[PDB]
């Protein structure tokens, strides 16, 4: 076997773990994370959550602004279930592409139903005397996210 | 070609439309065949009944799933 | 992870000196990474309105 | 120094702008799509 | 002991899959810089302005350092010291300093 | 991106297209009664 | 225009809604007339909906003033100290009810451009990026060309 | 019946209230103000359209920076994160990249593992080996 | 005074000199607290205090109200109470020493183990910040700490 600059591919050779040993190692890591989530050694959780067509990185005690009107009264508390990601300093749970409803419960109180600042939309075309000016006032909803809770069920 | 695309119900782009396999439709699709994509409609669960009209789904490989997101 | 505001900002926007050897090297492939490190396009905190940018010493 | 006579994309002498491989693969993809279409229009 | 990325920096990442199949978990604690990869604190403290004759004059000699320099030499000195161009350090007009916001918004 | 891989795996080209991220109702009440549905 | 007007961050004052929700609207004062035809919607709003609005919201104070005025107004004052004028001149009763509900559901801050659609305190969970958070250490902490 | 406009002060003031911050005679002269306010509003709408593209380009630059910091390219990182059925947009991916170094390192490790798994499955030339991260999860 | 002003205690307060001088405003607010104490149970007043005063530290860190000036010495005393003998400052990471913007990272080592690391412009400021990080991790005030429990028991 001669040594040629293109005879060997120009990337290092990759080796892979055996599937059954990967399964046992995955079970061990899942059991360790389950032991941690049962002992409650997590400090403060963050979560990437899908809501109203957008994805937000959301930590507890915080605020989000939603650009569309919701049919929820002020001061009502609601639960989000589309949590794509949850995590803390030691661990991180990914969804495929979503997490289970029995895994994580995340909860927000509606603060404010308001209207946006008046936005200006004007189109002008040159030397054809076309000007259109309009004012957009968008209903908005300010939400305060309160708690991120993880149940210790995990397979 | 504009007129045939109009009468085939293909005004909005990237939206599927179901049509017959008959030569009358096929002649128009032959005329505008360079502007469109044609797939067969596959029915793995068969034709939907009147109880399941609202619960159908159209998977983009070309199939009509009768029961979508049960329970 | 728990720092005060001014040293946290100083650590985030710290300027870094890089070293680069130019012996038997093409100037374009040298200048690609030299341009990247002079932008600070290797920083996830990069913004064009910020003063982020790192020093590069080429020998 | 060197000029295109007249407008670039009109005249007897035009810009010598060549074909690209991205345009080539786009053309083969469009041909494969229409070949599938004219197969499905056959029977 | 397998990892796609090296564990020399940041977190010691351990990836895993839930046996049901819809969840990817990962355990990532910090890696700490050990004692051997560090250097001791540089200790520098020397007072050469102290005089045996008069310490009250010696302390004033340490406060006797002052210098005045013109605008242009000051700008090139600042540019050489701070690794910026000379065009930033020149002042600005009344119209530019008046349109600066007196109370800018602040977050956090 | 990666619409082609989703096309071989059977998903839509767009992740917004008919996925479990899409037909689930993104909010619900904390006590557990269902939310009113989406106009879209 | 963002460069023309002022801007504020997204802020909830007194950290509202965190421990409990407090309706930050304090009072409404309607100034209307019994005689003017432009005060018709205000008069019908006073006849039907004001008592039911008072039952639904026990935390607000509603004053009604029939005075010889031409333009009917409503003034809303909040817990923040903010005062907001609104003209209820020549509107239908459902328009008046929608306007009062929109004033009730607001927090009371100044309606200008919001810089960012989120607010967070302590966003630096599990660290923050600095240029040394991913660079491995050299044995002895050595510089690339420093010899020991 | 002679009729004249009396509120012309408010007519010119509704234009001049948007032009107080201009330079030159455009903040005072009404003839020059109207053309300046019109172009300002048109540029406001067009830059509002371009704001999403500019912020998306900024997010792609930030993800490219924080992924090349781990030695993995941006397109490989994106497609191998999608191949694990993790659908995080580039805004929140840049957000994890800035504020979340261990989690972004875990995501880059997942993308590198998926890339090596896909390369191994390509060089295998067989359907029988299916990897631990190459399995496809259906909806339930 | 900020809580009382935003709750408009000054609007309901009866006093001369309208801006309600801040000891008088504090007196009126704690009079409202005492009125709530004689009105309802002590647990209700505890919930009100938790709702309207503990919510004021959101985003705040320990050392801008504690204002200690010697973190090194107090860390030594706290390590003596925890029975760890001596911390050692070691320069871990640095970028620039002759430039106008020096950056130093100083770590704290007890029995050759890393407990804290801090940034600074100067080595002394980085050492003080490392002591602040060590004291914060010892006392449990961190960025990583548990958020406050706002619930109904
Ligand atoms: Mg020509
Ligand atoms: Mg020409
Ligand atoms: Mg629509
Ligand atoms: Mg759009």
PDB file of N, CA, C and O in Angstrom, chain F residues 5 9-12 14-15 17-19 21 24-27 29-31 33 35 37 39-40:
ATOM      1  N   UNK F   5     -34.684  16.641   1.439  1.00  0.00           N
ATOM      2  CA  UNK F   5     -34.623  15.546   2.405  1.00  0.00           C
ATOM      3  C   UNK F   5     -35.974  15.309   3.065  1.00  0.00           C
ATOM      4  O   UNK F   5     -36.387  14.159   3.259  1.00  0.00           O
ATOM      5  N   UNK F   9     -38.360  12.001   2.962  1.00  0.00           N
ATOM      6  CA  UNK F   9     -38.872  11.418   4.198  1.00  0.00           C
ATOM      7  C   UNK F   9     -40.378  11.581   4.358  1.00  0.00           C
ATOM      8  O   UNK F   9     -40.943  11.042   5.316  1.00  0.00           O
ATOM      9  N   UNK F  10     -41.039  12.301   3.456  1.00  0.00           N
ATOM     10  CA  UNK F  10     -42.484  12.383   3.459  1.00  0.00           C
ATOM     11  C   UNK F  10     -43.064  13.634   4.076  1.00  0.00           C
ATOM     12  O   UNK F  10     -44.277  13.846   3.974  1.00  0.00           O
ATOM     13  N   UNK F  11     -42.245  14.467   4.711  1.00  0.00           N
ATOM     14  CA  UNK F  11     -42.724  15.726   5.254  1.00  0.00           C
ATOM     15  C   UNK F  11     -42.864  16.753   4.132  1.00  0.00           C
ATOM     16  O   UNK F  11     -42.463  16.524   2.988  1.00  0.00           O
ATOM     17  N   UNK F  12     -43.444  17.902   4.463  1.00  0.00           N
ATOM     18  CA  UNK F  12     -43.571  18.984   3.500  1.00  0.00           C
ATOM     19  C   UNK F  12     -42.222  19.646   3.266  1.00  0.00           C
ATOM     20  O   UNK F  12     -41.277  19.465   4.036  1.00  0.00           O
ATOM     21  N   UNK F  14     -41.815  22.891   3.386  1.00  0.00           N
ATOM     22  CA  UNK F  14     -41.835  23.885   4.447  1.00  0.00           C
ATOM     23  C   UNK F  14     -42.171  23.209   5.766  1.00  0.00           C
ATOM     24  O   UNK F  14     -43.097  22.386   5.805  1.00  0.00           O
ATOM     25  N   UNK F  15     -41.442  23.498   6.858  1.00  0.00           N
ATOM     26  CA  UNK F  15     -41.825  22.968   8.177  1.00  0.00           C
ATOM     27  C   UNK F  15     -43.177  23.457   8.681  1.00  0.00           C
ATOM     28  O   UNK F  15     -43.773  22.833   9.564  1.00  0.00           O
ATOM     29  N   UNK F  17     -45.744  23.422   6.854  1.00  0.00           N
ATOM     30  CA  UNK F  17     -46.742  22.683   6.104  1.00  0.00           C
ATOM     31  C   UNK F  17     -47.214  21.444   6.845  1.00  0.00           C
ATOM     32  O   UNK F  17     -46.479  20.447   6.934  1.00  0.00           O
ATOM     33  N   UNK F  18     -48.435  21.497   7.390  1.00  0.00           N
ATOM     34  CA  UNK F  18     -49.216  20.396   7.966  1.00  0.00           C
ATOM     35  C   UNK F  18     -48.519  19.541   9.024  1.00  0.00           C
ATOM     36  O   UNK F  18     -48.925  18.399   9.261  1.00  0.00           O
ATOM     37  N   UNK F  19     -47.510  20.081   9.695  1.00  0.00           N
ATOM     38  CA  UNK F  19     -46.806  19.338  10.713  1.00  0.00           C
ATOM     39  C   UNK F  19     -47.465  19.369  12.082  1.00  0.00           C
ATOM     40  O   UNK F  19     -48.390  20.149  12.347  1.00  0.00           O
ATOM     41  N   UNK F  21     -46.105  20.686  14.518  1.00  0.00           N
ATOM     42  CA  UNK F  21     -45.891  22.064  14.942  1.00  0.00           C
ATOM     43  C   UNK F  21     -47.025  22.968  14.460  1.00  0.00           C
ATOM     44  O   UNK F  21     -47.207  24.080  14.968  1.00  0.00           O
ATOM     45  N   UNK F  24     -51.201  21.595  15.995  1.00  0.00           N
ATOM     46  CA  UNK F  24     -51.534  21.695  17.410  1.00  0.00           C
ATOM     47  C   UNK F  24     -51.918  23.125  17.774  1.00  0.00           C
ATOM     48  O   UNK F  24     -51.388  24.086  17.209  1.00  0.00           O
ATOM     49  N   UNK F  25     -52.881  23.304  18.688  1.00  0.00           N
ATOM     50  CA  UNK F  25     -53.218  24.660  19.151  1.00  0.00           C
ATOM     51  C   UNK F  25     -52.243  25.176  20.204  1.00  0.00           C
ATOM     52  O   UNK F  25     -52.232  24.691  21.338  1.00  0.00           O
ATOM     53  N   UNK F  26     -51.457  26.198  19.842  1.00  0.00           N
ATOM     54  CA  UNK F  26     -50.228  26.569  20.546  1.00  0.00           C
ATOM     55  C   UNK F  26     -50.417  27.013  21.997  1.00  0.00           C
ATOM     56  O   UNK F  26     -49.442  26.990  22.756  1.00  0.00           O
ATOM     57  N   UNK F  27     -51.617  27.412  22.406  1.00  0.00           N
ATOM     58  CA  UNK F  27     -51.848  27.770  23.796  1.00  0.00           C
ATOM     59  C   UNK F  27     -53.100  27.068  24.297  1.00  0.00           C
ATOM     60  O   UNK F  27     -53.984  26.696  23.523  1.00  0.00           O
ATOM     61  N   UNK F  29     -55.525  26.781  28.322  1.00  0.00           N
ATOM     62  CA  UNK F  29     -55.685  27.294  29.677  1.00  0.00           C
ATOM     63  C   UNK F  29     -54.946  26.417  30.681  1.00  0.00           C
ATOM     64  O   UNK F  29     -54.731  25.222  30.459  1.00  0.00           O
ATOM     65  N   UNK F  30     -54.545  27.035  31.795  1.00  0.00           N
ATOM     66  CA  UNK F  30     -53.739  26.344  32.796  1.00  0.00           C
ATOM     67  C   UNK F  30     -54.528  25.289  33.557  1.00  0.00           C
ATOM     68  O   UNK F  30     -53.954  24.268  33.950  1.00  0.00           O
ATOM     69  N   UNK F  31     -55.826  25.507  33.774  1.00  0.00           N
ATOM     70  CA  UNK F  31     -56.633  24.508  34.466  1.00  0.00           C
ATOM     71  C   UNK F  31     -57.009  23.332  33.570  1.00  0.00           C
ATOM     72  O   UNK F  31     -57.368  22.269  34.086  1.00  0.00           O
ATOM     73  N   UNK F  33     -59.043  23.462  30.393  1.00  0.00           N
ATOM     74  CA  UNK F  33     -60.103  23.543  29.397  1.00  0.00           C
ATOM     75  C   UNK F  33     -59.512  23.972  28.054  1.00  0.00           C
ATOM     76  O   UNK F  33     -58.532  24.726  28.024  1.00  0.00           O
ATOM     77  N   UNK F  35     -58.672  25.735  24.452  1.00  0.00           N
ATOM     78  CA  UNK F  35     -58.673  27.071  23.888  1.00  0.00           C
ATOM     79  C   UNK F  35     -59.644  27.149  22.713  1.00  0.00           C
ATOM     80  O   UNK F  35     -59.976  26.126  22.108  1.00  0.00           O
ATOM     81  N   UNK F  37     -60.365  27.786  18.824  1.00  0.00           N
ATOM     82  CA  UNK F  37     -59.441  27.391  17.752  1.00  0.00           C
ATOM     83  C   UNK F  37     -58.890  28.556  16.945  1.00  0.00           C
ATOM     84  O   UNK F  37     -59.270  29.713  17.156  1.00  0.00           O
ATOM     85  N   UNK F  39     -58.235  30.716  13.473  1.00  0.00           N
ATOM     86  CA  UNK F  39     -58.965  31.054  12.252  1.00  0.00           C
ATOM     87  C   UNK F  39     -58.307  30.441  11.024  1.00  0.00           C
ATOM     88  O   UNK F  39     -58.991  29.924  10.130  1.00  0.00           O
ATOM     89  N   UNK F  40     -56.975  30.470  10.978  1.00  0.00           N
ATOM     90  CA  UNK F  40     -56.218  29.807   9.937  1.00  0.00           C
ATOM     91  C   UNK F  40     -56.400  28.305   9.962  1.00  0.00           C
ATOM     92  O   UNK F  40     -56.415  27.658   8.911  1.00  0.00           O
TER      93      UNK F  40
END
